[PDB]
Write a protein that binds this ligand. Structure first.
Ligand SMILES: Nc1ncnc2c1ncn2[C@@H]1O[C@H](COP(=O)(O)NP(=O)(O)O)[C@@H](O)[C@H]1O
Ligand SMILES: [Mg+2]
Ligand SMILES: [Mg+2]
Lengths: 594, 596
């Protein structure tokens, strides 16, 4: 038995060594992270999962490569609607057309809290439902014990919001997040660093961090970086830049490979505390343009084009960005392409694409009344700030809009109205302060050889549409003339109303597609793309390559998260190990214990 | 025109980029580091060079791999002699044999400072001479601007010093180091963390850090370590242990392997927990034990005393020494030995030169460590030293006139085992070893053992193997084979001393050849016997070393050794590796902490 009992001695000795190992090693645990996207059109939850690691005498940290989106939630009320509804009730209806004493609105702070509460309860219910459905029991125990950091950030929707209203709303939003329902057991918590409005530049920087993280271009490890003989860490692969065109604004972000004019303000990632010191350094141009988003540029373009006598004659506005055979009521109201081929224009003021701009452009807004600069920017886009809201949004002496399907005239107008206007488009003090009045100035003062990624649903639909009809090659790499010739052909299509409804009939029997509420004005976006590509092509430095991407595939061939600012905002916080440990784990949800 | 000016534009753009580069990059600078070895036989300087790097917003640090010894200086007086000389003058002569009121010695602190000053001025002169001779003008500018950290550490020589004397001396030594001659421009400086006595365990730990650093076994980068799936950093190669036999003590150091079973009485050191290495370095549990009286000089004195007080060896005034060659004869004393050109051995009569002085000085009834502790008195009496007798009779080998060599290796091993390796009671001044759970060398491998490879170091330890290799008695690839070593040494140690015209010679028994008889090899057979005994004890351990190597030096990246084996590199590393603390003490406070 001295070989049998000997194996028993080694079992007992192993039991002690295993136990000793368990008390010396690092332990992994699952954490949930929540990003609330408070956008122009809606407020939506984004539920993420990440792997945390705790080591004896080293604390706890997140493995940044483990960050994965589990679900993007339902589209609830935007913050603009919350504030505008509260103003309708407490400042009275048509406060957009009258002087409002903002001081008097302070007596209605509890009522603003009640409005904000309604939205917060829906978002909490949505977040909890996603968590309950995706996690198993063991995962829920970990997720519930660690605490759930919440980052609610607002973008272009309330970026141009007047007076003190928005910032008071943020104080209320944080209080609501810090008091979740005790019933579900999920410990949601926030602070003024996680929950706040983000600037257009930050928004762009965060989307740049997301892109480079997911594509594996950004990293501090030997796989993604290299330390030279002088101790400087360089990224192994070029960091790529990003163009993101959303609903309300467009972000242009690129790392510099440089010597800049004194007027241009570039961001150093380390110096500006976006990335920790251990990460490769980069000087990045990040500029955001209000009125360049899909919805906001649609409203502005109609208003400016249909007020020019070259386009407006005897009640008819001739729109070169719209198809031949397409007709709509002369308004910036939301368009619904109906099954019968008709274009239904929504007359509800809240649904009009000019509402945000016409609301900003008011003589009762201190930004207009005290600043001639801002008034002239408004008047340059045919908005008279002295007139009531209804006439500010109205396209005067215009009954009907008719499409002419003339792509070059469309490009020409997109260039003069949106890309290279005489004055900066309104609510762009931030872009102007960084040295850029308009899109045309971006590539004139700063250019880079850094590759570029073009993002945004509409930007992608523009290329994918031309690819589907075999008008563009599947390997399209940004060729301007190739894009202009493809779009010139597609945009000269006739709109035919058939039994099966409105159809885009391509010239040269090249086929067809259905006309709908998302693609009826896609030609304006193709014109924006062409104009943008020409401006990038004119820069002293030209991108090494240009790519259009819907998503970035993870290590298993499947994307781990979406493109956008959400992953970036998480990384911006979690990468600063010490600060994150103190705020997420030391203080944590227990900071709220009352 | 446009092609040529575009290039001219590119020269201007380059001029700016070169300067942007300079103000963004890390910059390298040379620093000198000084380790003063305050050992048992002497106090000697060790001048090192290291590359420092300063990075914007990261401060300054030393590249540990750049540490190189430029020179080990002259052997000046040991701290023991400084203190005993001071006692001779202020407590009076023969204070070793009389009661001394230690309280009264406080009035002589300035005089202790004056004695210490004499030694410090010699060491400073030696250090400055080494620096002036090795550095060029650009190197001197860097070395002079950065400041020169000094680490004076005392070992076995003053480890057992009585009363408060030694610690008062350290306060004076630091003050002297912090006030260098302004003339030479080298800005030497120290503090109580760098300049202090070091325990035998620390001494062993530092020699272990040196060995593993130089051999590239110890490291924190992907080349020398690996991080597992659970975030634990392991060394890529096995960390090796060390046996170091110096002049006064011997250190035994080894890392403990996975699932090691330790009795509660055995105290192993965790490198990170005990702050020897920073957290970023692989963790290890290390047995480090030091034995006083196991050094070359101290064991020579003790061995003679014990062997020649034994009736099996002492008869008719002749002590028969089996550790000494046939035909070798000396005066019966532990006094320093000189092999003269005529073949005669002259034993030095000077009490300060007698190898028993440190032990006989410790073993006194007027030392509170003996008078209050029967334990210590019994340890002394077990080595034939009566602490009640004057110094002269404590050092004397009674009724013994002549020591004659018998060249009997097995009798030599037998005696080294009973006297030195496995004595009845622990050898005196070993409370530190005893406190860590080890009374003697024989207990080290009984209580703890490891599969960790072992390196055998020390001047005598290497001479023992190299001598047998030279006479082709041992193979060049000797890996520690006990019977092979005993067989080789038995043959070599049975050699006869022949007195020739060109001086005395060691004649090998079977025309195997010969070598010159000198003051360094006359008693080498005791060290061979110590080696054999040590190897048998390691071979008896539950876990045996993967391999045993005898090394004089460790080769650097260019085939040439960067530094010596020993505690010196280790003590530097122990401080420089803690980046933040080193930056604060060496650079933020620096030599300017001393500014008037
Ligand atoms: N298939 C499609 N074709 C063209 N445009 C499309 C599309 N799907 C969405 N879009 C456009 O993206 C925008 C969606 O807005 P978001 O990306 O949510 N930006 P924000 O609300 O956070 O500010 C809409 O304005 C819509 O016009
Ligand atoms: Mg958005
Ligand atoms: Mg020594």
């Amino acid at each position: 038995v001295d070989a049998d009992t000997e194996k028993r001695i080694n079992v007992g000795k192993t039991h002690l060594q295993t136990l000793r190992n368990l008390e010396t090693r690092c332990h992994d645990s699952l954490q949930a992270l929540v990003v609330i996207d408070a956008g122009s059109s809606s407020t939506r939850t984004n539920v993420f999962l990440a792997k945390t690691r705790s080591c004896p005498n080293k604390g706890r940290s997140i493995d940044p490569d483990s960050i994965q989106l589990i679900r993007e939630g339902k589209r609830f009320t935007g913050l603009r609607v919350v504030l505008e509804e509260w103003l309708d009730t407490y400042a009275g209806k048509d406060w957009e057309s009258r002087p409002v004493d903002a001081r008097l609105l302070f007596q209605y702070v509890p009522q603003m809290h009640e409005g904000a509460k309604k939205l917060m309860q829906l978002l909490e219910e949505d977040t909890v439902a996603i968590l309950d459905s995706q996690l198993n029991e063991e995962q829920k125990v970990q997720v519930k014990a660690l605490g759930i950091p919440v980052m609610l950030c607002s973008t272009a929707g309330v970026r141009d919001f007047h007076e003190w209203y928005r910032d008071a709303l943020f104080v209320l939003l944080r209080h609501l997040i810090n008091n979740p329902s005790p019933a579900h057991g999920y410990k949601f918590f926030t602070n003024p660093f996680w929950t706040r409005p983000i600037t257009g530049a930050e928004e762009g920087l965060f989307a740049f961090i997301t892109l480079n993280h997911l594509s594996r271009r950004l990293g501090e490890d030997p796989a993604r970086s290299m330390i030279d003989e002088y101790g400087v860490k360089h990224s192994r692969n070029d960091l790529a830049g990003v163009v993101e065109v959303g609903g309300a604004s467009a972000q242009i972000v690129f790392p510099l490979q440089t010597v800049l004019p004194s007027s241009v303000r570039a961001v150093n990632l380390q110096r500006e505390r976006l990335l920790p010191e251990r990460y490769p350094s980069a000087d990045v141009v990040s500029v955001s343009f209000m009125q360049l988003g899909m919805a906001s540029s649609a409203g502005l373009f109609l208003k400016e084009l249909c007020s020019n006598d070259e386009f407006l004659q005897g009640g008819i506005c001739s729109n070169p960005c719209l198809f031949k055979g397409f007709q709509q009521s002369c308004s910036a109201g939301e368009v619904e392409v109906r099954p019968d081929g008709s274009a239904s224009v929504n007359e509800d003021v809240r649904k009009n694409r000019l509402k945000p701009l016409a609301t900003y452009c008011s003589v009762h807004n201190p930004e207009i009344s005290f600043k001639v600069t801002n008034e002239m920017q408004c008047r340059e886009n045919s908005i008279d700030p002295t007139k009531p809201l209804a006439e500010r949004m109205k396209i005067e002496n215009c009954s009907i809009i008719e499409g002419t399907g003339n792509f070059d005239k469309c490009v020409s107008q997109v260039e003069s109205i949106l890309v290279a206007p005489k004055l900066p488009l309104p609510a762009n003090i931030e872009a102007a302060s960084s040295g850029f009045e308009s899109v045309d100035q971006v590539f004139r003062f700063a250019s880079s050889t850094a590759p570029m990624f073009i993002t945004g649903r509409g930007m992608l639909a523009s290329i994918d549409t031309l690819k589907d009809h075999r008008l563009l090659r599947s390997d399209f790499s940004g060729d301007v003339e190739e894009l202009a010739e493809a779009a010139r052909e597609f945009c000269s299509s006739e709109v035919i109303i058939r039994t099966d409804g409105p159809v885009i009939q391509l010239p040269n029997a090249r086929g067809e597609q259905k006309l709908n509420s998302l693609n009826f004005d896609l030609c304006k976006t193709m014109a924006l793309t062409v104009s943008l590509l020409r401006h990038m092509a004119a820069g002293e430095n030209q991108p090494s390559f240009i790519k259009w991407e819907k998503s970035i595939a993870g290590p298993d061939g499947k994307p781990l998260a979406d493109l956008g600012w959400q992953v970036g905002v998480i990384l911006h916080h979690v990468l600063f190990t010490e600060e994150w440990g103190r705020t997420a784990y030391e203080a944590g949800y227990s900071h709220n214990l009352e």
